[PDB]
């Protein structure tokens, strides 16, 4: 009910069109999608009405797109929010003339409330004048005209939660609109840490995914998914259950995701460097191509999932042996239901190999409410999680979703159920 992902076509700007897409993956949403400048993110900003248009290619998807070289001062930093019941959800990303003096070496950057920061810009342009790095419209570091190196950085020791946001950079004869942009994103715990007092332990993200601070669960590149990032998806999509796919006949190339806002934005896996068009290295493989393959006999190195073990072995390195993991997969679920006002008690079942614990299994509602198994029990190898609702209305009929998500990976199936009172 919260999979939200924003597509920034190009964060560095230029003569051709540039877009950002917001996209929901497997729900209706039930209030409007938004796009636009985020004010409060870095001030300043134009205040231009953005034009936002139904994206026909994703199912439910909002974009913007600007006409190609009336792509006048569009750097910002921008936003797009989803609403259900009462909770927004939030992903932001920034826009910079690729003509640049400096470039910002990362889009985004997450940290932990301890870890001591360093923001870095590269240098691209050389003027002979002094270099400054603001922060949203304060100022936070200066150099001198003739001491201004290949790498500008701040140094951020001991970062603290007020120490996020978007970080500029230029020469100081320059403004806003041509400026370099940086978000740092500070976790408010330090790491593997979680909970209203930092005082649980997160589940453990693999491929880079990182751990959400009010839920311990992780949050995966796009391109892996499941409850701790292990499971390659296919080749070129992303969205949580990693039913979305890169349009286009070079995969996620020039595609930059950015996601909920504990992850910030990064390439899908399998590409690198501003715009994403890089390809990645021998060796290497996750999101910015940042994982270092360590195949322990040798084992194919796949830049977009990892080792590529032979027949016996699974893992990261291909370590482990053992029964073979199985992707959950909804079983026995109907199109439709058709079912009378009153107590509703619905089933989910799920197979799979590390067998979906009751922990693992939900059920949401078409306007997004998300529900927990009342009973529960597995059978030879399938999962059985048991649902009530009090009393299901009539309104409440639509397209609702069992949730299964494991370490094997993730899987949603929708089932339509129609309410009516009995006459
Ligand atoms: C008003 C202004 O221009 N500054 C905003 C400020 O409102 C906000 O508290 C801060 C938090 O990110 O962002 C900017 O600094
Ligand atoms: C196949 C299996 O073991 N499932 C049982 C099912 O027979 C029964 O309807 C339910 C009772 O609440 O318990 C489990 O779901
Ligand atoms: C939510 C949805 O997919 N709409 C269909 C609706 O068109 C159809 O009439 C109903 C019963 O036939 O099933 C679903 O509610
Ligand atoms: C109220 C109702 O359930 N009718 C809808 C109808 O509007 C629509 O044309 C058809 C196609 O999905 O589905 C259902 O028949
Ligand atoms: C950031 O710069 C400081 C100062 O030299 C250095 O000690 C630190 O390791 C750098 N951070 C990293 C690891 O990138």
Known sequence: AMDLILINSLPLVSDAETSLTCIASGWRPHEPITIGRDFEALMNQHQDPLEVTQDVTREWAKKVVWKREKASKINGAYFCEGRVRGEAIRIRTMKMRQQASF???????????????????????????????????????????????????????????????????????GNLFTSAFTRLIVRRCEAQKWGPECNHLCTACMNNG????????????????????????????????????????????????????????????????????????????????????????????????????????????????????????????????????????????????????????????????????????????????????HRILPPDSGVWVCSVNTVAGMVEKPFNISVKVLP
């Not at 360093?118 to 005209?145: C, M, Q, T, W």
Request: glycine share 10%.
């Open 210 to 389: 990182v751990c959400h601070e009010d839920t311990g669960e992780c949050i995966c590149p796009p391109g892996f998914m499941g409850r701790t990032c292990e499971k390659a998806c296919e080749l070129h999509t992303f969205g949580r259950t990693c039913k979305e796919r890169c349009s286009g006949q070079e995969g996620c190339k020039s595609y930059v995701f950015c996601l909920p806002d504990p992850y910030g934005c990064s390439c899908a896996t399998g590409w690198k460097g501003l715009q994403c068009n890089e390809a990645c290295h021998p060796g290497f493989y996750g999101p910015d191509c940042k994982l270092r393959c360590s195949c322990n006999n040798g084992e194919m190195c796949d830049r977009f999932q990892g080792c590529l073990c032979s027949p016996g072995w699974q893992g990261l390195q291909c370590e482990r042996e053992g029964i073979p993991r199985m992707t959950p997969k909804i079983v026995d679920l109907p199109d439709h239901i058709e079912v009378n006002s009153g107590k509703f008690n619905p089933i989910c079942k799920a197979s799979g190999w590390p067998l979906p614990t009751n922990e693992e299994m939900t059920l949401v509602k078409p306007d997004g409410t998300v529900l927990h198994p009342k009973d529960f029990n597995h059978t030879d190898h399938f999962s059985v999680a048991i649902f009530t609702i």
């Open 103 to 173: 470039l910002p070496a990362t889009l985004t950057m997450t940290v932990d409330k301890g870890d001591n920061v360093n923001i870095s810009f590269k240098k691209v342009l050389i003027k002979e004048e002094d270099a400054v790095i603001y922060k949203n419209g304060s100022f936070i570091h200066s150099v001198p005209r003739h001491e201004v190196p290949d790498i500008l950085e701040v140094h951020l020791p001991h970062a603290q939660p007020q120490d996020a946001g978007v970080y500029s950079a230029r020469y100081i004869g």
